[PDB]
Design an enzyme around this catalytic site. Structure first.
Site, PDB file in Angstrom:
ATOM      1  N   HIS C 137       8.319   9.839  -1.170  1.00  0.00           N
ATOM      2  CA  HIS C 137       8.872   9.564  -2.490  1.00  0.00           C
ATOM      3  C   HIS C 137       9.563  10.896  -2.894  1.00  0.00           C
ATOM      4  CE1 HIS C 137       6.911   5.676  -3.669  1.00  0.00           C
ATOM      5  NE2 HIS C 137       6.083   6.005  -2.681  1.00  0.00           N
ATOM      6  N   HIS C 247       7.007  -3.175   0.535  1.00  0.00           N
ATOM      7  CA  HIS C 247       5.825  -3.152  -0.338  1.00  0.00           C
ATOM      8  C   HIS C 247       5.826  -4.597  -0.913  1.00  0.00           C
ATOM      9  CE1 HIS C 247       3.308  -1.081  -3.617  1.00  0.00           C
ATOM     10  NE2 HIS C 247       3.315  -2.379  -3.950  1.00  0.00           N
ATOM     11  N   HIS C 273       2.016   0.911   3.947  1.00  0.00           N
ATOM     12  CA  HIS C 273       0.603   0.785   3.551  1.00  0.00           C
ATOM     13  C   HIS C 273       0.027  -0.578   3.906  1.00  0.00           C
ATOM     14  CE1 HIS C 273       2.642  -0.599  -0.073  1.00  0.00           C
ATOM     15  NE2 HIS C 273       3.053   0.632  -0.381  1.00  0.00           N
ATOM     16  N   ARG C 333     -14.514  -5.307  -4.204  1.00  0.00           N
ATOM     17  CA  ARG C 333     -14.919  -6.290  -3.186  1.00  0.00           C
ATOM     18  C   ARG C 333     -13.858  -6.415  -2.060  1.00  0.00           C
TER      19      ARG C 333
HETATM   20 FE   LIG Z   1       4.162   1.323  -2.143  1.00  0.00          FE
HETATM   21 FE   LIG Z   2       5.107   4.264  -1.794  1.00  0.00          FE
END
Ligand SMILES: [Fe+3]
Ligand SMILES: [Fe+3]
Ligand SMILES: [Fe+3]
Ligand SMILES: [Fe+3]
Lengths: 225, 564, 564, 113
Positions: C137, C247, C273, C333
């Site tokens: 970023h 994302h 991610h 959870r």
């Molecule tokens: Fe992200």
């Molecule tokens: Fe990111």
């Protein structure tokens, strides 16, 4: 030593904490930067000792400094504090909510014109609609999403949601849990109602002319069962 | 749908009629108008408004903003209102309601949020124009980060560096020194403009300097501010449309204040440290502030008037001017009268600008805090202005913000480019958190890019972890600094290709309309009066009424915010 | 002559069959082969080998190296071996045995040590390629020194600085912002590549960005990752040979994970991610990692899985996304199941890359330490890989090093220039002391020059005295940084003279071969499996078997090396 | 914290003052930079306590360090000292004339013909 630029930053933060500690010992009421550095140094100390969890520290540091230990307005100025520290399991972020106990004084205080509620989307015609998330996973739908194009997991009279959006605050989302049934309030989309994108069921003006084509595409793509 | 007032304000910031406390001061800004449509407000985030085909358009538009500052509370001479601010091509493209007309009502036509738009959440923040410091001594390049960290984006003045001339005067003298400094300027993020030596009784030497790139001239007593010098300097300035700044004859060697005023002959001139502690005809230099042609400014050390102001000066004057320890006093009787009056004169709109006098009897990163400390001090002493309409300090706020934003811009001939939050102007803006207004800014935008901001741990998982301190951003670096920074020059220099000739990569713009700016031209500080000083008591009089103020024992925007 | 094994190793470093402990981890690198001739090893110093007419040639040769890294232990996907590395014209000229064929046996023909050769003693050091951080970023320019200090030489991502849009997304949106950032990039030593906003259901707005210099697009949910935007974005990327990063729709608004996968339609995409804590379809984003077309990466905060991982996130998510304190849990959870599985999936070669998510739910100078902490954690848990041949962890090492070197390079279309220690590639290398491997590098070489290194007292009689800290070297400065740094662009931009048009002085290279990179294309991480998530227990399964790992109470390359 | 570049400078000055204090406590005669930092830190401390005026401090700090508390020539080398500090009424400049008591040793002494 091989000191990284982030380690050089932490020395200054730690020294500021040590100066703040000295001033508190002198009996001085700490200001905004002193209060932040005092709490930061404590977190950095406990992390090095490696006997407390991040969870423990987050809880321990709420009202770490009391209202009379700091200057007026300091608590309200610092609603939350964040400090990254090395633990035996590596660098972790310690996030404290209300590290300094607040008082009656507030810098940057907003005084309302009236306590009366704000009528959002005033004059728009509300459409009540029963929706059921027949899917195995919960989902949310945003204020400006074209309701008609929502996840095919949602079961509702799609024809009634054509050219409409949720009558909820701008930026908010409505949650419909797996198996949950809810009554939603829909209002017609603003501007020209030129709906481009999302699930591509419409891609044009939401008029009566486009409706049959849109309903057929929705059925074909599995949105309408 | 009905939204609870507290919830609305948390989500979008204050709306029409709401009052915001400026920092820890007793000044209250009231939202005069809100340009939104309730329910159509832009919010950035997951599941929020600014998303493909929703708040963000899928329809191409010639007015697609490069940046959107959502739900900003603008504080400017133009008004204290709530609006979305749209930046495009490093300029303020529009102010109003941004978004997608395809899905939203009441969208300002030239405020299209699209695929190429970046988002900046201004909800609950105060947006102001970047400050202009018209009294910079170019002594140290380290003044620049200090200035930016205090919301100042433009700096006018002069210097060569840590030499006696600069140490004393805002003067970059002669062609060679001007060229050297304009080329040195390339390094910085700060907008600059240089003044040459106005202290000349010969045309040629003055003309050379304007043609070398000077935005004007500084007449300073250290080089002799004689009536001959005053006339010759103003004559060249008038010919070349450049500004003249003055530090008058303190020792009244060639004449008294009236002799200086006579030499000026109603011509436009910027009078630095008008109060006189920073220098000028003793004890009556302040009397100049009443005159229509005199554009007066104040330097930070005398504003606000505190219990330590006089004590600090009776020694600070000895370090700056390098005086004998045999010299004890005169300043002890003269100074209280004029320092006190100066604060009231600011509240009355008699003194139009606030400046620094940076490392030369004044502080670099203090223009903005000290202006608001004075505003607060007066409000606390004299109460709410009679000029105010409603339970707010909007008029006082507008009067004070103009001192460091619009009024210096008007004086120096850059009001068409910078100085205020207006459509068409360069996007030199400052984002403030209301709790830190006037003391600690959040983000500094220059030419539509973030150049400087408060930033936490560089390694950190988010931008918030400690230590949070001021750092240079992308707009301050590489070749992007040439796109975001301006070097102001004279029209003669500009028109004769100074940019190309000196190989300056920065934006080069000319200063224009300096010669016909009077007190009437300012914003909220157009007050003219008959200012007199008793030569025995040193008391200041405005149209025969004693002009004074009490010294502050404590100030706002200070002790709560700073470590040292 | 017979030399004692201990004496050989002290003088020249380890040879064939020797095992090196990587830092304080339980990972052992075995020297697979030695390219030297015993007795002919190059040593620099007084009375040593590299001297006029001896180890250094007096015979001119077209292959005279500019730099020689003597007796290096290379750790790369290509192998773990002992060799001399030869640099010439900022590229890896040769790998083998360097020296003088006039006086020595077994010299690699294109590895001539001569009058123009500089010496760098690599005896006893580990040499690896510079890391590539494919999830940056561009929030703060202060991330760059932090990154270099952790062995990262290339960063792909997006941003405008500390604006909300960047605080959440790796996007530099639109033409104007792309141009501004590419010009800002000139400042740095770091190799850069920018991603534009992919979240568009309109062609024009996407095309503009590739032509403006973007190396690809990022589809982030905060801008609306709907199936329409997924299809439109990939279509333009396919046309322009650029990469797409995703994302996903966390809230499942427009569909579930399978609906997103269907929108992709088997097209090449970099799934950021992959575990899901950083963002994506709750709770099944991880299921994408099994797919052949999905090029998955992990971010730093979830790797390795520790006893503080879950606690840290249940608040770190609230600071980044700015959530109400009314929100307590669901993440309590969902998260343990996927965070644990993620570590196992890395060891299995299912997740191919490690990235940072710098200052936006992830750490800038942590990619390299955290990769090795995970490798170590898994070695300690699951044991030595069955894939190993000998008392060593070579296969595991090769699997892990590929995650931050070669695999990100393949994904982004820069594998022909950088990514590994191979002849012909750009000399972007990192020198490590085995005791500090993966935690603290010694020297950072970019384009054949030292750009950053650990350095002691500037006044000091030698470079070793305290305080020893990371500092910028000559290759990072002046016009030499333009010779050592690369700004990656699209072929369209490259071919249309973006370099000249934007006046970029840095090396400008195009990204090529992004569209046809599948899991099969990676190095040591080509594993495809049927990944499933129980929507009730949140447990992750690989081919019907539960995919889990135990949380670490302590990690390697941490407590022993850092002050804070 | 929002630390300004001027606040970062003051931390170094204050730490230098703290090191100087430690060395004086050890019984070491302070040198030129140690003496300046020792007096500077005192001024910075008193300003934060906000009980003394600038006028009071200027007077209090004359011969704050005595000739035997510093190395020879130190007093002569530092004829005046200036330190800006935040008081309850804002940042003010504390100007001290003869902060260190001089001794008959003079580095850079001019001897007349
Ligand atoms: Fe992200
Ligand atoms: Fe990111
Ligand atoms: Fe002056
Ligand atoms: Fe001045």
């Amino acid at each position: 030593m091989k000191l990284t630029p982030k380690e050089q930053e932490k020395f200054l933060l730690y020294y500021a904490g040590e100066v703040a500690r000295k001033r508190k010992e002198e009996g001085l009421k700490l200001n905004q930067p002193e209060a932040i550095a005092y709490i930061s140094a404590h977190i950095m100390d406990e992390a090095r000792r490696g006997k407390k969890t991040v969870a423990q520290l987050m809880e321990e540091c709420v009202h770490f400094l009391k209202k009379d230990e700091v200057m007026p307005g300091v608590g309200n100025m610092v609603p939350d504090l964040g400090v990254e520290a090395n633990f035996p399991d590596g660098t972790k972020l310690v996030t404290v909510n209300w590290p300094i106990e607040p008082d009656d004084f507030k810098a940057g205080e907003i005084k309302f014109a009236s306590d009366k509620d704000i009528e959002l989307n005033a004059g728009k015609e509300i459409t009540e609609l029963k929706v059921t998330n027949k899917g195995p996973k919960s989902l949310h739908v945003g204020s400006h999403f074209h309701f008609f194009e929502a996840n095919r997991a949602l079961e509702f009279d799609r024809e009634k949601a054509y050219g409409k959006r949720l009558d909820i605050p701008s930026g908010n989302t409505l949650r419909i849990g797996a198996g949950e049934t809810k009554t939603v309030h829909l209002i017609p989309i603003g501007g020209s109602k030129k709906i481009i994108g999302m699930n591509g069921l419409l891609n044009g003006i939401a008029d009566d002319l486009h409706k049959q084509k849109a309903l057929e595409k929705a059925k074909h793509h599995g949105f309408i069962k | 749908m009905k939204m609870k007032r507290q919830e609305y304000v948390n989500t979008y910031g204050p709306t029409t009629g709401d009052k915001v406390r400026l920092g820890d001061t007793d000044l209250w800004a009231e939202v005069e108008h809100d340009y939104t449509v309730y329910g159509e407000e832009l919010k950035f985030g997951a599941g929020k408004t600014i998303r493909e085909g929703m708040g963000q358009s899928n329809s191409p538009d010639e007015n697609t903003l490069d940046l959107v500052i959502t739900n900003a509370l603008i504080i400017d001479y133009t008004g204290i209102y709530k609006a979305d601010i749209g930046i495009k091509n490093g300029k303020i493209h529009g102010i109003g309601k941004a978004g997608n007309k395809d899905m939203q009502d009441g969208v300002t036509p030239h405020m299209v949020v699209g695929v190429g738009t970046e988002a900046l959440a201004g909800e609950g923040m105060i947006i102001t124009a970047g400050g202009i410091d018209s009294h910079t001594h170019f002594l140290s390049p380290q003044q620049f980060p200090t200035a930016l960290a205090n919301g100042v984006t433009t700096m006018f003045g002069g210097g060569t560096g840590p030499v006696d001339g600069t140490n004393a005067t805002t003067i970059t003298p002669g062609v060679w020194n001007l060229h050297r400094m304009l080329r040195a300027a390339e390094e910085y993020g700060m907008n600059v403009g240089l003044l040459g030596k106005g202290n000349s009784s010969s045309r040629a030497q003055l003309v050379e300097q304007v043609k070398a790139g000077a935005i004007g001239f500084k007449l300073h007593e250290d080089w002799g501010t004689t009536p001959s010098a005053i006339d010759h300097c103003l004559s060249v300035a008038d010919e070349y449309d450049v500004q003249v700044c003055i530090h008058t004859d303190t020792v009244n060697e060639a004449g008294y204040v009236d002799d200086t005023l006579r030499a000026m002959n109603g011509r436009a001139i910027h009078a630095y440290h008008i109060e006189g502690a920073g220098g000028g005809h003793s004890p009556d230099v302040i009397t100049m502030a009443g005159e229509v042609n005199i554009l007066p400014s104040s330097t930070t050390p005398t504003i606000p008037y505190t219990i330590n102001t006089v004590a600090e000066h009776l020694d600070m004057l000895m370090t700056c001017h390098h005086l004998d320890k045999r010299i004890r006093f005169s300043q002890s009787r003269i100074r209280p009268g004029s320092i006190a009056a100066e604060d009231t004169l600011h509240d009355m709109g008699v003194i139009a600008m606030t400046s620094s006098d940076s490392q030369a009897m004044g502080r670099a990163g203090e223009v903005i805090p000290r202006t608001w400390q004075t505003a607060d001090k007066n409000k606390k002493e004299f109460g709410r202005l009679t000029e105010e309409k409603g339970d707010n300090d909007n008029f006082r706020i507008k009067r004070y913000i103009s001192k460091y934003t619009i009024n210096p811009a008007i004086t120096h001939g850059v009001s068409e480019y910078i100085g205020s939050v207006e459509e068409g102007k360069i996007a030199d803006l400052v984002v403030w958190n209301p709790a830190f207004f006037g003391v600690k800014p959040k983000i500094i935008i220059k030419g539509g890019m973030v150049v400087f901001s408060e930033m936490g741990d560089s390694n950190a998982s988010v931008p918030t972890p400690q230590p949070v301190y001021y750092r240079e951003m992308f707009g301050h670096h590489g070749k992007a600094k040439f796109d975001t920074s301006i070097t102001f020059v004279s029209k003669v220099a500009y028109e004769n290709g100074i940019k190309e000739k000196l190989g300056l990569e920065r934006k080069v713009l000319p200063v224009k309309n300096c010669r016909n700016v009077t007190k009437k031209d300012f914003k909220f500080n157009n007050t003219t009066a008959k200012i007199t000083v008793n030569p025995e008591t040193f008391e200041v009089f405005v149209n025969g009424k004693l002009c004074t103020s009490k010294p502050a024992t404590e100030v706002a925007l200070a002790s709560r915010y700073t470590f040292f």
